[PDB]
Structures are given as structure tokens and as C-alpha cells.
Amino acid sequence: AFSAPAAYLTHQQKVLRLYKRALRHLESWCVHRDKYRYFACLMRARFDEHKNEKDMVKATQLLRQAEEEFWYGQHPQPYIFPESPGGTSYERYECYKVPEWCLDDWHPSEKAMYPDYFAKREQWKRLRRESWEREVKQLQEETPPGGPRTEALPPARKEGDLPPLWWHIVTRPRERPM
Template sequence: MSVATASYVARRAAQKERVRILYRRALKDTLNWAVHRHLFYPDADALREKFEVNRQVEDIERIDRMIAAGEATHDKWRHPDPYIVPWAPGGSKFCRNPTPPPGLYPFCVITYIFLPS
């Protein structure tokens, strides 16, 4: 494989990864705007259609411009207060029961004493 071909393949792989990441982020953000599934599914189909329209584009420079435009649009229309799963980092239940401070550890140890019967 020549250097030019390897460079082309590597750039196309990077573009595919960026498109995949953009699609997943946009799909998750769509769920923040349409909180009920019956509202989400048509929006998800419309989003998928926007991506599918440009699936056959082969010009590398045009693909880079379209990805940049898609990322800019996503950043512009991101939800200001996204839904976070309660037990995930940033959620309301995350670290609800944190570990005790280091100075309290000897006092928190439960000691079992077994007496001979």
C-alpha cells in the first residue's frame, strides 16, 4: 500500500469515527429534547435521514466541511439541562453514600469476637 493510499484510508477512518460520534451525541441530545419515546422516535428517524442523505459523498474535503457544520449545529442546539441517569457521575444519586473520611476508619471497623461455647 502506498503512502497516499494509507493516508487516504486513515483519513476516511477518522471521518467515519467523527460521524459516528456526532450521530450518537445528536441522538442522545434528541432524547433530551423529546423526553417521551413516542415523541423521540419520529425525531430520531428525521435525524437518521439527515445523515443518510449524505452517506454516498466521496469528496474528502466536502465531508470534513459537513462534519464541521454538523458539530457546530449540534453545539448550537444542545440541551441546556440534559438528562443524567441518577447513578451516573453528575446524577442526583451519584456518591450518595461516600466512603468515610480517612481519620474515621479505625472507628468504623466492626470487630467480631467469637467466644468458645
């Protein structure tokens, strides 16, 4: 989720993803641990048989054919972690995620409470104002001509520099704000 995506998925990426999906769905099928371990090792062994195959056409024939088998026995109700995109608590706490700039709209009587927090916030705002002005030039000079080719950002290269476009990545609300 954090890393930028690639222009495509290689054959080894596809086989690894298929291995991951198949092993997760077999764990969903095999509730008990010993049965799952035995069948997972049997599946791993079966998987490793075609490991040294060099024919690309044959390589294409492998896995895609397996994918059809995976689709046939894909356990229509697989196990999903609670916070995963299919879990029962996927977006439970998105309603508690309040943006940071909202604090700029607080009444002064409210800002009277928590003064140290707002002082540190002012220091953060100063740092952002300087760093963004540096980052604009840094990204303008480092970006390839004709526009970027991959949505990955370069790190900071000087001493006082900060990572470009950092304000909204560092200032995430929290995973569980309340």
C-alpha cells in the same frame, strides 16, 4: 472506561459520537416516546444522506458544520443517567468504598469473626505474591524497547500465568458495597 484510549479519533468515530450526542439531546428535547421516535427517524434519515460521500475535504466540511448546529440546539439541561458523571447519584457510594488492605490492620479479636474469609484472603495473597513475580518478568520481556507506546496490557500466555497488573483490577471494592 475500561479500554485504553487511542492516539486520536477517526472521522467515523467522531460522526458516531456526534450522532450519539445529538440523539440523546433530541430525546431530552422530545419527552414523549412517539414524538422522539418520529424525530429520531427523521434525523437518522437526514444523517444517512451523506453516507456514501468520498471527498475527505467534503467529509471534514460535514459533521463539524453539524457540530455548530448541535451546539446551538444542545438543550442546556439535558437528561443524564443518575450514575453518570453528571447524574444526581454520580458518586453517592464512593464514601462506602473501603480498600482491601485495611483488613490487614484489623485486631485479632475482629479477625476471630469471619475466619473462612480471611483464609481465602490468605490464599489470594499467596497467589498474588507468586503471580506478581511472574508478571514482572513477563511484562519486561513483552514490552517494546524504549518504553510502551499504548497503555494497553497484554494477556497471560502460559498455563499458570495470570494477567499482568491484575491485583487492583480484580480487587475493586464493589459498585454498592453498603
